[model samples]
Target: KKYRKCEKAGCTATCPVCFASASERCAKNGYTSRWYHLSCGEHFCNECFDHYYRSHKDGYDKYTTWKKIWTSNGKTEPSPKAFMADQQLPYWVQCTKPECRKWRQLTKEIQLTPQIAKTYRCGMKPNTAKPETSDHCSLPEDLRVLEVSNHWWYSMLILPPLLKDSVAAPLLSAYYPDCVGMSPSCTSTVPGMNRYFQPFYQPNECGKALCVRPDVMELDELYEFPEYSRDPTMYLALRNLILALWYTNCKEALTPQKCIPHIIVRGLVRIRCVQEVERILYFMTRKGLINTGVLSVGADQYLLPKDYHNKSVIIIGAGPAGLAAARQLHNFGIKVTVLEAKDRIGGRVWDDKSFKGVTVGRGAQIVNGCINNPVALMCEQLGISMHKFGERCDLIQEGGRITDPTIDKRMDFHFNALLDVVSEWRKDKTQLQDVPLGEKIEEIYKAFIKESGIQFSELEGQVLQFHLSNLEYACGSNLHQVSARSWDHNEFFAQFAGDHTLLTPGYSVIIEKLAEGLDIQLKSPVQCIDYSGDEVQVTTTDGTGYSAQKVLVTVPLALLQKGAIQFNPPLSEKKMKAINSLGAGIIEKIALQFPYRFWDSKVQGADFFGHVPPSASKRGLFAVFYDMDPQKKHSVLMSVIAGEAVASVRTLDDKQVLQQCMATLRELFKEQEVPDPTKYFVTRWSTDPWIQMAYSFVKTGGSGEAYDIIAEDIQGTVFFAGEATNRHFPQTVTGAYLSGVREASKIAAF
Candidate 1:
């Protein structure tokens, strides 16, 4: 907005009658790129150039680069017939199609058109029909180009009359030498991806974008898998990618490969919501369903328009969902303040940086799928890196006994075969009854024993039991409580793709980034929420009541189900039923830091190792162990003490727990000496009152519909969001993250 102004020159720009007394000599220029006669364009000195160009209507008359003029300034000297004839273009000239006024010269840099015919001439598009007015090459006969004569009214007024004294403008082109599209209307404005002058701007020509929301899955051929069924092997990958564009609201043409990697819609870029599709891609790849394989995510920064200036919201919980919702609302210029019950951040998903070289997550932290996951995208966007450890696990019996390598393959084949049976039961409408996942798996065990002629019990029973052990960890619930019928019903949506990945430092890294600039009250647990009035009043445990236009309740499901945050008038009967119907289960994570690597002697090199309990009842005791160190540099081993085993060891103190873990490891490495751990830390998620469970699980006789029901907003005053509220991908960090954004978008639109 700083227009040109001359120092102490009365602070105003005037088109004073050229005081160049026709008798006086031509004026000397300031920044040197000036001329006296040609003429004698003495009206404005270099110092006064900016003022005249900025303050007066005549300033928008013409434009040209100073770089263009410096080189062309040499000798228009005599102003001769040949001298005038050789003048370079894009050259400026006094506009006088009406008549030769001689003062105002027009140029394109002013970025205008219509007024050109009056004071400025030749402003029209490439006109040569009547050189008298329609062109810069005005008739030399009347000196119309220079105005009146080559001896006076110079056209330099339309250009930067001096080197820089008249301009003083910065070369913004120097700021971003690296470009994204460099097209007429594109450049690298967003952060992260760096490119020097991105030449290929059109997304259609480049293979840099990725597609999400491919409701393209669920085709008839896709109630499917290659090994489990038949020939359309690409049902999940191919079909989903193909239809992804249509669902994205993008009608643009796709690549020749028939895949929608990136799309251009409404002349902007959007990226999110591939849980259903990426889920398909993830499990499909993990189960051998399909073969492998943004720079524009800034649009995701602000989904809702920033127009709500007076709207305010109070969010309960600083978990992923709450923080995410707060961020979205805060971006819209709305006032938001988050209240968390925890002393720290990151509800279920948390990390401990106490370890030297590597970090360990004290709560749920593993990312099930890296592809199309908003959490994963945030890691990429923010500079944090996710470590994708090899998904190899060595199976062994307790006490240094190595099982056959082929046993791993056989167990996978059998487990999937069992799951195949469950899928069939789902498709059979008559068998629509929901039972515990454990009951069905046990039932399949009996049938498989009869068919394979192998004793399912006692022979490979521990291997089978360990699979159930992992399943409980996966859903954060006891197997018998997990509904069997509703498990495979997720075929209706897409999912994230790629193997599980871990944030080296921890989940809190993301929480810290998301909580920036947000007003979060830590340790201020929300005790009551009253939404009966137009404005929602949320009261914290300390009796401080904060009122806002709306309230977003993102507290964990366990807390809500327990009436931790009591609703003043009571929630709808149906909402309460939905909350009660969902299962909130628990598990524990213990990190043991040893003096040196001892497990390597038995398991060699594997990211994690599975143990086959001597008895099925003990399946959850020291079930799985993972090397938390990214480089295998540290001797910190993290074990998931899940299911029935959690309560069994709940009585044991931290010292007692370390002994329990080492006792199992001692059995794991009987030949090697097992030393006492240097330090140990255990996560007591169950005992923690604020977070009563690990995460939500689909209970027996319940379906994902309960998730949707829980997600239902209460009279549009109070909204709910958490992993428990996400029906598509639950019991994972991505589910909670997506749920946050989902509820925020709803509140935004509201």
Candidate 2:
């Protein structure tokens, strides 16, 4: 019987509601004399009346009640006198025949102005002058006193005013609903309900549930409070001015006003909120979740870039360098894609947790030069744990000939004198350029031995050789192969004087935090880089190709040396020569977890020295030993075998290497019986196909400019970044990260 109004307005003979050709009159009402259909009882379009009330009574009534309450004529505050009525009171009006109900209510309406009134007085009670019926008493039976702490009450008074702001109202209604008339204890059994409930709830398409909690109070519902709560002039006295004391304490600190500023409120919410906004947007690109052209609240951004002119960049690795580039570039609103060749991130700085007992780092363990070091700075920011090692050096000799205190003092002086010479040589590099560090050290040692007239024993000579080789240990290359000019290339940033600190959780903590929010494709080794045209194209081994405006190459120098990645246009002659000149040195580390610490318990640093033969090949064999845990709780010993010895050890099997390491330990601890290790781990960086060498060093004939040369960008399209390209802090994790950020800044500006 329902009929709809038609677009044909001027058809006099047609039915008014249905617009039918047949003549049928509509049932009209008296008040303004408007036309209406006969199917509806009142003056309404028959189609709308029937569709709303006839078929869906609940929907019509719900909307009608909402409109009536919300659209009430300018009624902002509730009535204070109405609260005295039984039906208008809060939920204390429960059916409490068997159980007693007790509740606390705000007897007076909240006021924005300051007019002195006595709070918590008898007249301020919920049922003013007592309720008329015995069934609805002001004080319900079995009322238990709920004691609230001073701070709790203080927070309530201050929170309400701040939560009343329009900007914060929605967040409070979702996260903290107690101010909105809901029970303070009411919690939803739904996801993300403990905090802000997603207002745009659409689970089927948008992946959020439809909000249906009865406890969720709408802002408009506050206007319906009882009459007694509307104007509370009669009930304004206090109990001993105690409520004033609470308010005074709440307003004592002016900081609560400072905290409620727009930026501070937004920052506070962002710090606690989980970052699902960005993730949802990233998935939107894949899922095709819609977005408005103009920015909308809670809208996914990846599907719609804020700035269409933002250039896209492709980073060639997922190591610290590449990740740092991605994080910074993303912050600048540049689109970044990081492609990692390995199965996981952290190319050289790997955390090996597969030993089943203890965790170990194969490369770049310590945050060297802690003061002003970028790696240390980042670790401090990210809250990564670190421990400082107070290095204690021990000299082990045959029959204790070199154990004489005078001999030890003289050896220490000799080593320091040699360091002074290296410093002097660095100050005037004209005489030291292209001169190997080994040649300078040899000259200084011979002069000191002759001048001091100290007759050295065979074992003493071997110990001196160990001290001389400490340079190689630090450099990750033989002293003879290291250029004296560039030997101090990293000293610009290595100004910290104290112990070198190790990250207990490992360097990967930095890598993981930096890689957050970045699109990283792992297990996709890059095969070729073609920057011949305006758009640079990178092809991976999987036959997948990616195009970007600029490409950053952060891959290891070892791989570059191997020519693993083919460049469509060959690199510059100077860059190629610099790459070939830089030495990718090897330093093999073996981590031995022992059943107990047999070494000296008093030692807090590098504890032992196992002297190998004087032959060139054997000099670096088990060169130095470090106590991984000085407290002996971990019972781990770490050994460093640098230069030629790493290559020698790599030739042996794991079992053979273990035997050699055990033999060296037995030789160092001849007095105490050194038992076989419970477990062992060794790093073979040179043998690994992905990383052909451990770290970069300045070769004998190379200058520090080689790093700068290698770092230069080609045609503003292809850029280079890594530890080797960082001259000031080369061979360190911080250098790699800085290099990446440097290249990213260049590309961002471009």
Candidate 3:
């Protein structure tokens, strides 16, 4: 953690004993060394040896001191006097490899020794020779000869140049003087030889005469530091590297050992030790020199190609899918223009941060499969705060809370068991894809009862049915409408444990970040597409016409199915059939912000609640409720409504919807007078002009094939991209983002 300079200038080499750089070499031997004996295979430096005679060896025995220095140099030898340790010890004391702390000891005979072995312990307390701690043995089978050089040493020498002008550069140079002015340079003359001096330096940069090293950049053959020529300046490169480190840490996480090497290699800075890098990273983070949050959000800032010649592309939507496509196409050297029906981006993933009590997300609230989800990755880049929605759901019975803990355990056990069975059943390829999930559940329930030799009561069956209906809630459709075979197919599971995470501030920030650096025209809903001519022309609702070589349609699938935007020549039969075959299910959210936490005691302060409706038909109504601000004093509970309930809610006004929601809450709380909500937020995805439905789901007979058909290009001119186009991860933000990138790649190929 600390550094010391050499007393003289010509030594040029580092001491093998203390790993210190210096100018003068010492004259000493191993045996009659008089407090000067080289303890670890005769690799001791004179300065370090001097410290021993000055009574600084008080804490260490002679052998302990020797072994300590020995191991510090990376020697794995069990004893300081091992035959193998003595054989390969170098004259300069220890190995000079940069960042590698090990003494070189290869063979089993004394290779280098000095004259006075008898005068070794003159200035220290003399003691009789001790027994050897370890006996000499044959080399281990894994032993291999290592080639040593100053190439690594050169990396050490030029670490300064790598850290040149970054934030940590000045701090490091001042702290470690040897790393600055007195560091030695590698003498290599090849095109890319030297680590510090250029292959050919500027006329007066270092000196007029060329001082090329004897070794022609031997390290060049092994390594060529990764280059990002596109970066305009070193600051930009450092920023990118810093951002990359944050993302890597978020993904797999970084350890001191694993992270230091990566940072040195990527940042081009030679950190002294593992802990030193950790300290530096901590300091850099605490000082706010880098903004990981600002860096994490959005697409690549400078992904656009330098020499692009392709004609511009016209994207019909500015959602995640649309912006992703535009970013990719622009990076590929194609011009891109994005058109959004709404004033902002993120079609269904809306965020509302205007309220004082709590920020609310009207749609796409949970970050499902957040570990690897593209949306989550974007949020990570943007530095968004993500918090887990803990799994502690309080059950609301008929007009009262269910206080029985056994009921919660049984529901969880049966739910997990059913999922396991469903996972096994999906592997049965012979099963009909057209079979509805409702039908599959009935069959599975019968099988579970008969094969497992268990008789379930009516109440238990209803519990199982309630659990089964959660799938419908997830699908945003009735069990009878969802395809059993396709429900879990290609469903990406989150690598992280615990419930789904929610983003703070808003999900809309993600959309805003993604929409950066693109030519986006807001409130420009495309009314029609004319592709009959040489150039593709799109007419907006305002009658503004825009022409491009190709057109990418990223609007919600329901709108396309509803014929919201007319095609000049009409879509192909296959495309039309695929679009119509896919079903867009509606799911609504009614956010009620309370003046005070009234349901706190009745709910036992749980973050989530599921209400069991009195009627079977209302099973999926406002059954699921979430506490938006769980730890806050004032509560904002968002109720999710799906299936047959979406239509009935659409017919009511905001006040009417609030009253209905309050009525349900009162019943769940078993209270007569439920206080009126201070504020209310509701989403009608089904009736939204641009986004006609909440999201797409696989129907009873439909599979990924339908999505593939829908995503296919038309005559290599019109492309489709959106959540509906993503076969593997439909209905999620990740799917939409990936679909955009996929479609853009297809367009760039032409």
Candidate 4:
């Protein structure tokens, strides 16, 4: 296969024509268009007009020559002809509005309410050829009207704000000379299509302003080909976008398109999940750039966030949220210390392939949504990739019914109601301090679902129980103990970021990165803290006292209220009351280690909803993410137990948990013989004695303020940080990073 080369030697990109190389071409259009791809277009030439597309038409490469300059400093401008060269054709442009359904901007950039075409008409009279340049209009007001072409051309008319301080605009615009004649070139043109190519700029009838032509992408004809039929580049691009958003946008000028290229460079590629792939495609196609250059594969070497001069901080817990905070703060040049009650990091997020030689997440499982989240970002930054959550899991309802529209809807309504109930509790906490979320949800909706169960067959009722279990996973606690308000707030947070992704690789790395460099003492539990003095004194259980300007006590609320760390003078009565009243919701991840995936060939990965009894129901769980390697016949199942259900699972030993899990699986499948496991490992985070819980959720009357006591400085010396301290991003690694940096900022400022 003679790969079509970008005739412009030194140019490196997918073929100019179809975004693929020549050797990869499957069809030909004309003399100049040598090869054809399936969906995109010619790999080397535009068949209809028969011309070569300039390899630099794409934005990724164009930025190399692109620059933004302060408009105030610009007097000597490029010629109009020169500006023409910089006008690149779009790869995938669409009208942002789907309803009115325009593929380009509806209105001129200058006017927000009026449509662009309407504004153009109102601005000028018909048959005007060109307008004289007078004042430099802001954005849409200054755009030129386009009269011809079937290509996507939104940029020539619209400009996102390039503030006065920006230096890049003028440097690149310099390529264009005279206000006319010197048109800086852009976009490869297929000759003879000049007639079809719309005018780069148009004049209103009055000819006072040069309104930009509306950008539009000509609908493309779909081609049939094996290799080009389904491009995975879009998905890869989506993975990149997720990484950038989660990682605090450390990279300079990261757009969705730029995000993809950077992610590929970082090496966190998940090619197995179609949703992941499709997401990037949707984002890139919108940006008009959907090509991953050769798909670079490798892990991202973690780097600190900002070079924040000099800063020092401490973090408690090493779970996903805490680690996220650490990575962000570390990048910002803050010295971070992680205090782990246990000897290692990775809090509740755990996955090991050692159980009977089958991979299993004994703790946290599933990368929920990979497109916009902190965990995905950390993984990308660390160069670790993840598979989609429940890639093949089917929703197995009772009696062989695949619960889709009905059960899924029922569960969502149930969860939403739970969130509402939780919110109300937050507003009126005093009256409901003793009440828990699990009890409220069960009291309100259990009877409803139970009654609805009659509509379905007897077997389906069992499936209903498992479906209700999602609430447990949703709130990280059972229905009886979780506070309604806490559950609602936590659910909102999860829906925003956490719920979207699952840690296929586990959440341990979060802590590893947060613990990277700084003073992190693990397996050393703090027994007492003296904040009365200028420099706080921390005493460990071993009687080793360490003195620091600030000590961030980040033990879980349950442990904190348990009086694990005795504060000299005892925290304020109010703080003590808050601590005593704060309730830690229960959540436990149970791992069922099996020699092989018994459900293989029968169930999709999500095949465990409503497969259990009502006694075991929580929310958002029952049969969740099961780790399995289908091709290899190696597998393990991880089930989440939260809320009141945790109490039952807590009493059961690993042997008992495994027994119940296997039996549940057998019941779901209606099978007698099942795969037996050789080994098993379960996490007792709440029972860990040191950390004492997976995460913290505010009880009905409890606010995160008492946790803020640790956030307060001790005589401008002591500081505190961790997921708990971050009000905006609480209970997350991102929150922890913010918390660490905030404390570091305080230290640096002082």
Best by lDDT: 1
For every model shown, what is its TM-score relative to the native structure? Answer: 0.63, 0.58, 0.60, 0.54
Model 3 poorest ten-residue lDDT run: 181-190
Give lDDT tens digits, candidate 2, residues 175-218: 33222322222222223221211222222222222221222222
lDDT of 3: 0.57
Residue 578 displacement in candidate 4 (angstroms): 3.4
Question: 1-750, model 1: which lDDT tens digit per residue?
Answer: 122222223322222222222112322322212221122222323322322243433222322232233234332122211111122111233344445423233232332222332234443444423344444544353223223232122222222111110000111222111111111111123122221112112222322212321212233335543321332222322333333322232222222212212211110000111122343443332221122101111333432334634778898888888887777666544678999988887888788888777778888668776655666556655557777878678776777777666765677678878888887876753324777888898898888788788855453667767777877777776688887877544446655555577677688877787787679999898888988887888888999989998889888888888888889789889888888877888889899888887777665767888877888778798888888876776888999888878878878998888888888888877777888889889878888888888888878777788889988987777898888998887777777877777776677656
* Residue-level error in angstroms, candidate 3, position 661: 1.6
Positional deviation of 151 in candidate 1, in angstroms?
54
* Two-way TM-score contest, 1 vs 4, winner: 1
The Cα RMSD of model 3 versus the native structure comes to: 17.2
Error of 3 at 92 (Å): 25
lDDT values of the candidates? 0.58, 0.55, 0.57, 0.43
lDDT of 4: 0.43
Best by TM-score: 1
Regions more than 4 Å wrong, model 3: 1-301, 328-334, 415-433, 446-462, 492-499, 648-651, 671-673
lDDT of 4 by residue, 517-556 (tens): 5456778776777878755677778887766545555556
- Higher-ranked by lDDT: 1 or 2: 1
Name the 10 consecutive residues with the lowest summed lDDT in model 1.
264-273
- Going through the candidates in the order shown, the clash numbers are 20, 18, 28, 117
For model 3, residues 1-750, the per-residue Cα lDDT tens digits are 222323333333343233211213433322212221222112334433322243545322554555564444322342422311222222221222233333223222222222111112111112223224322122221111121222242232212212212222222222221222111111111222112111122222332121212112223212322231222122222332343344444433232333332322111122222223454343333222222122322344322224445577899998778877876665445778998898878888888776676678888777764543555555656556676677677667656757366765686597777667766777765435457777777788678778889875545555555565577777888877887777765544312222377765676777776666669999898999999998999999989999998999999988988888999899988888888777888888888877777777766667788876555577677887887876657668888888767767767987888888887888877754567888778777777888978888877777667888988898899999999998876787767877887787677656
Q: Which is better, 1 or 4, measured by lDDT? A: 1
